[PDB]
Amino acid sequence: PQITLWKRPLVTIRIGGQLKEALLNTGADDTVLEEMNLPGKWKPKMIGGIGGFIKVRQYDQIPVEILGHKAIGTVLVGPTPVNIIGRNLLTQIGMTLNFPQITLWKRPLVTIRIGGQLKEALLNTGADDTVLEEMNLPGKWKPKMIGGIGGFIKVRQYDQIPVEILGHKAIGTVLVGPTPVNIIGRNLLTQIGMTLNF
């Protein structure tokens, strides 16, 4: 089965006996669910995203059913804006990125060429938009706020910027700001024909 990225890759999961909607997120190392009760022991942990760090409860060896596939692993619970299924569980259910095939054992980092520079960037199905580290691109831009795990950051929005990714040409909106990692979001993933497969 194949999941395209023109919309957010949302799926129903079953966890602790309950159904929930969650986002299949190649940009997350970990699985993070909104405030809920889970049985058993847990430990306090901190995780980070765009916007900064948040406190979560780490529950280990939790069973989670996703797209009819059973995973058993770490589930973090905390003030995430969206329920997220990260690579820790995507790998268990055999999910890969395809356009060539990219497994999710490691962060899916690839070289992109943009505004005449080469940079490493994260292929991120949990990102609507493409966000790059600070760079002085020419052209008109307009300010924008984008949200992630820890809150919002201010970015500059540039339109119709050519980006080559894995040898595929793309052209579209690139946001530039103080992101901790360069992110390729669905706006450009769809253009290079990337899908999620299992």
Binding site: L23, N25, G27, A28, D29, D30, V32, K45, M46, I47, G48, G49, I50, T80, P81, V82, I84, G86, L122, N124, G126, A127, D128, D129, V131, K144, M145, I146, G147, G148, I149, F152, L175, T179, P180, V181, I183, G185
Partner: peptide
């Protein structure tokens, strides 16, 4: 608003 949900521990 746009969500960009990169995450790491």
């Amino acid at each position: 608003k746009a969500r960009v949900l990169a995450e790491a521990m």
